Scaffold this active site. Sequence first.
Site, mmCIF file in Angstrom:
data_model
loop_
_atom_site.group_PDB
_atom_site.id
_atom_site.type_symbol
_atom_site.label_atom_id
_atom_site.label_comp_id
_atom_site.label_asym_id
_atom_site.label_seq_id
_atom_site.Cartn_x
_atom_site.Cartn_y
_atom_site.Cartn_z
ATOM 1 N N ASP A 140 0.837 -1.199 0.000
ATOM 2 C CA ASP A 140 0.000 0.000 0.000
ATOM 3 C C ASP A 140 0.882 1.263 0.000
ATOM 4 O O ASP A 140 0.402 2.288 0.451
ATOM 5 C CB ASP A 140 -0.972 0.003 1.187
ATOM 6 C CG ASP A 140 -2.083 0.969 1.030
ATOM 7 O OD1 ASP A 140 -2.449 1.308 -0.108
ATOM 8 O OD2 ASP A 140 -2.670 1.395 2.060
ATOM 9 N N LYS A 143 3.014 3.279 -5.652
ATOM 10 C CA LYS A 143 2.557 2.230 -6.554
ATOM 11 C C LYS A 143 3.627 1.692 -7.457
ATOM 12 O O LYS A 143 3.594 0.498 -7.822
ATOM 13 C CB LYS A 143 1.323 2.652 -7.332
ATOM 14 C CG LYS A 143 0.125 3.232 -6.456
ATOM 15 C CD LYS A 143 -0.110 2.371 -5.182
ATOM 16 C CE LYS A 143 -0.895 3.147 -4.120
ATOM 17 N NZ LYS A 143 -0.768 2.475 -2.779
ATOM 18 N N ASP A 168 -3.148 -3.231 -2.557
ATOM 19 C CA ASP A 168 -4.194 -2.157 -2.675
ATOM 20 C C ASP A 168 -3.981 -1.419 -3.955
ATOM 21 O O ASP A 168 -2.841 -1.335 -4.504
ATOM 22 C CB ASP A 168 -4.159 -1.159 -1.518
ATOM 23 C CG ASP A 168 -5.401 -0.351 -1.452
ATOM 24 O OD1 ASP A 168 -6.449 -0.758 -1.967
ATOM 25 O OD2 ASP A 168 -5.309 0.747 -0.881
ATOM 26 N N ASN A 169 -5.060 -0.827 -4.468
ATOM 27 C CA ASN A 169 -4.948 0.181 -5.529
ATOM 28 C C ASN A 169 -4.486 -0.332 -6.851
ATOM 29 O O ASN A 169 -3.878 0.395 -7.619
ATOM 30 C CB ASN A 169 -4.086 1.338 -5.131
ATOM 31 C CG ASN A 169 -4.496 1.977 -3.823
ATOM 32 O OD1 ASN A 169 -3.710 2.008 -2.820
ATOM 33 N ND2 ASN A 169 -5.728 2.478 -3.746
ATOM 34 N N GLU A 198 -11.442 4.011 -1.686
ATOM 35 C CA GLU A 198 -11.879 4.476 -0.376
ATOM 36 C C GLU A 198 -12.704 5.764 -0.507
ATOM 37 O O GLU A 198 -12.303 6.728 -1.153
ATOM 38 C CB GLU A 198 -10.696 4.637 0.571
ATOM 39 C CG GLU A 198 -9.577 5.534 -0.063
ATOM 40 C CD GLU A 198 -8.424 4.741 -0.615
ATOM 41 O OE1 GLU A 198 -8.665 3.642 -1.195
ATOM 42 O OE2 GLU A 198 -7.232 5.149 -0.488
HETATM 43 O O1 LIG Z 1 3.548 5.456 0.849
HETATM 44 C C1 LIG Z 1 3.556 6.649 0.479
HETATM 45 N N1 LIG Z 1 2.495 7.361 0.003
HETATM 46 C C2 LIG Z 1 1.189 6.748 -0.071
HETATM 47 C C3 LIG Z 1 1.123 5.566 -1.056
HETATM 48 N N2 LIG Z 1 -0.344 5.378 -1.329
HETATM 49 C C4 LIG Z 1 -0.965 6.135 -2.227
HETATM 50 O O2 LIG Z 1 -0.386 7.041 -2.846
HETATM 51 C C5 LIG Z 1 -2.401 6.024 -2.469
HETATM 52 C C6 LIG Z 1 -3.083 6.920 -3.301
HETATM 53 C C7 LIG Z 1 -4.443 6.874 -3.508
HETATM 54 C C8 LIG Z 1 -5.101 7.848 -4.452
HETATM 55 C C9 LIG Z 1 -6.169 7.410 -5.185
HETATM 56 C C10 LIG Z 1 -6.814 8.301 -6.017
HETATM 57 C C11 LIG Z 1 -6.326 9.590 -6.081
HETATM 58 F F1 LIG Z 1 -6.963 10.458 -6.952
HETATM 59 C C12 LIG Z 1 -5.250 10.029 -5.373
HETATM 60 C C13 LIG Z 1 -4.611 9.142 -4.522
HETATM 61 C C14 LIG Z 1 -5.224 5.833 -2.911
HETATM 62 C C15 LIG Z 1 -4.550 4.941 -2.065
HETATM 63 O O3 LIG Z 1 -5.309 3.974 -1.459
HETATM 64 C C16 LIG Z 1 -3.158 4.983 -1.888
HETATM 65 O O4 LIG Z 1 -2.648 4.029 -1.097
HETATM 66 C C17 LIG Z 1 4.853 7.379 0.603
HETATM 67 C C18 LIG Z 1 4.879 8.705 1.077
HETATM 68 C C19 LIG Z 1 6.154 9.294 1.240
HETATM 69 O O5 LIG Z 1 6.233 10.572 1.620
HETATM 70 N N3 LIG Z 1 7.237 8.588 0.954
HETATM 71 C C20 LIG Z 1 7.130 7.318 0.551
HETATM 72 N N4 LIG Z 1 5.983 6.679 0.401
HETATM 73 CL CL LIG Z 2 -15.083 3.069 1.727
HETATM 74 CL CL LIG Z 3 -4.608 2.537 5.283
HETATM 75 MG MG LIG Z 4 -4.063 2.432 -0.766
#
Ligand SMILES: O=C(NCCNC(=O)c1cc(-c2ccc(F)cc2)cc(O)c1O)c1cc(O)ncn1
Ligand SMILES: [Cl-]
Ligand SMILES: [Cl-]
Ligand SMILES: [Mg+2]
Length: 215
Positions: A140, A143, A168-169, A198
């Site tokens: 998660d 990506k 996820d995703n 979500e």
């Molecule tokens: O893990 C790190 N970021 C979140 C990864 N997860 C996602 O980006 C994520 C995004 C979305 C999403 C879906 C639609 C939309 F329009 C915008 C975002 C949904 C989700 O369910 C995710 O899980 C991260 C941070 C950092 O500063 N350094 C290293 N890693």
């Molecule tokens: Cl939901």
């Molecule tokens: Cl989560």
């Molecule tokens: Mg996610």
Amino acid sequence: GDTKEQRILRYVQQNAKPGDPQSVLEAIDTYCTQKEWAMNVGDAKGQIMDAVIREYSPSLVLELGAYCGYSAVRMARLLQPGARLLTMEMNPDYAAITQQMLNFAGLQDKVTILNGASQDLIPQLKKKYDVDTLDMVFLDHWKDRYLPDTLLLEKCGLLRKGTVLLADNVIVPGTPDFLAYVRGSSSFECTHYSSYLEYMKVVDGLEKAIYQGPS
Ligand SMILES: O=C(NCCNC(=O)c1cc(-c2ccc(F)cc2)cc(O)c1O)c1cc(O)ncn1
Ligand SMILES: [Cl-]
Ligand SMILES: [Cl-]
Ligand SMILES: [Mg+2]
């Protein structure tokens, strides 16, 4: 001023019952439905996660990407006594929120939140963290990291026959290389669970990929 993640934690602390993981999940989902969206796994996909967790009853779970600790609460609340979750969160502010969220939920003894990059931490799991193999991995994080980190897990000897990857995703934002890779590999048996992003009327999904050993 405060961040969204600080606002979510505060809302939980003020609208959930300490030591009650279900109330914590409910508080977060209310907040994110009514006040502000956030990238927690959410209830729709969360219910599928729950079903998977209950099927396999994993003793040791690795999570890549914690965020605010929603998925970690979700999984840890269903683990059997003594079972454990390690979650890798490279964003320090997210790591701090996650720890506070798990403390509030009373699940701190089941979960270890490591603040570091997965690619740095994965190679330390055996020697530093006394891991043999993983029972389940929840992906998660970024990506574009799902595939490289999957290949790293295998390189490091952390996967066994039957290790469950749950991603996820895989539709939104999407993980095209990872998804094509596992679905094409004789070393994975894959199942797609169609769901919803979500807190949104947008299709998303989880992929389960069960490792089968070398081939
Ligand atoms: O893990 C790190 N970021 C979140 C990864 N997860 C996602 O980006 C994520 C995004 C979305 C999403 C879906 C639609 C939309 F329009 C915008 C975002 C949904 C989700 O369910 C995710 O899980 C991260 C941070 C950092 O500063 N350094 C290293 N890693
Ligand atoms: Cl939901
Ligand atoms: Cl989560
Ligand atoms: Mg996610």
